[PDB]
Amino acid sequence: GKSYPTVSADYQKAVEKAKKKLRGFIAEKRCAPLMLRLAAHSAGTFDKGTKTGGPFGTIKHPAELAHSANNGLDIAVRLLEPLKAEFPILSYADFYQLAGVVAVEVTGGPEVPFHPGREDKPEPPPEGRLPDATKGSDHLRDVFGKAMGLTDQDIVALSGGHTIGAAHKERSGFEGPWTSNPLIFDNSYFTELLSGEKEGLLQLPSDKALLSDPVFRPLVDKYAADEDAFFADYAEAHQKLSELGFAD
């Protein structure tokens, strides 16, 4: 359903150079998970019915950073500002989505296709569109399905993004990594979810909801058994998420 806009050759050159600078920066700073969260949070405010929110640069606004669900993302925005300044031609919207794609790549994940041309929009979406980690499958479908327009497959695949990173008691209140290797992108999020709760690892109520849902569970099983299948479905879902409201 996508018709990607034309951008100048200079814009394309900047995308390519910024991608490389982002790899080095994100790897050195060890901030891939935070950058993936920034990109996803960013994108996850899209409401299909109204065509509002989405990955349009608004997360840099103090007003959106102040949203409770975005606790700690001000760190991400600050970290990227010096690099962003080297690429004045790029929209923030594109830059943050490129950072999310790079975060996945430099931790060993799939190569998520990237298309430039998102415009920076003036108005942040209203607060309260991002999902509540204490809720379950009905809520997940309300947010990913009814608002964003993503599929049940996309929900489970994207949940696997938690294979990198950790919660912080000072941010959400939850604490700790989902996996034993929080800077490695692999299917361990699903392996861990299946094995039960191991000491030192985190499972949110929203993660556990995947295990008991008739549609979500076979997907968890598939991804735990087949990392290639996870990578394919993840790449599809991340691309879709990063393009919500963009190019149709």
Q: Choosing among ligand TBV, Na ion, none, which partner's interface includes residue 179 (Cβ < 5 to 8 Å by kind)?
A: Na ion
Nearer to ligand TBV, 41 or 84 (CB): 41
Residue window 14-53: x/- pattern of binding to ligand TBV, with contact defined by CB under 6 A: -------------------xx-xx--xx--x---------
Among the listed residues 151, 181, 191, 239, the single contact to Na ion using CB under 5 A: 181
Among 110, 206, 236, 240, binds ligand TBV (CB under 6 A): 206
User: Which sign, positive or negative, has the C-alpha torsion 22, 30, 176, 199?
Assistant: positive
Piece of the chain touching Na ion by CB under 5 A; list 119-127, 156-164, 191-199, 217-225: 156-164
Cα 151 to Cα 33, 50, 214, 238, distances in angstroms: 23, 18, 14, 12
165 counts as binding ligand TBV under rule CB under 6 A: yes
15/158 with CB nearer ligand TBV: 158
Residue 174 binds ligand TBV, judged by CB under 6 A: yes
Angle between helices 227-242 and 216-225 (to 10 degrees): 120
The number of residues in the chain equals: 248
How far is Cα 89 from Cα 202, in angstroms, rounded to an integer? 40
Q: Looking at beta carbons, which residue is closest to Na ion?
A: 179
**Cα–Cα distance between 182 and 170 in angstroms, integer?**
18
Instruction: Check residue 172 for interaction with ligand TBV (CB under 6 A).
Output: yes
The listed partner (ligand TBV, Na ion, none) that binds 109, CB under 5 to 8 Å by sort, is: none
Among 183, 164, 166, CA closest to 174: 166
Quick one: residue 74, left, alpha or beta (phi over 0 = left, psi -120 to 50 = alpha)?
A: alpha
Question: Does 184 engage in binding with Na ion (CB under 5 A)?
Answer: yes
| 187 contacts Na ion (rule: CB under 5 A) | no
Q: Is 171 in the site for ligand TBV (CB under 6 A)?
A: yes
Cβ(139)–Cβ(132) below 8 Å: yes
Q: Which of 83, 133, 184, 229 binds ligand TBV (CB under 6 A)?
A: 133
Residues at the site binding ligand TBV, with contacts judged by CB under 6 A: 33-34, 36-37, 40-41, 44, 72, 130-131, 133, 158-159, 161-162, 164-168, 171-172, 174, 206, 238
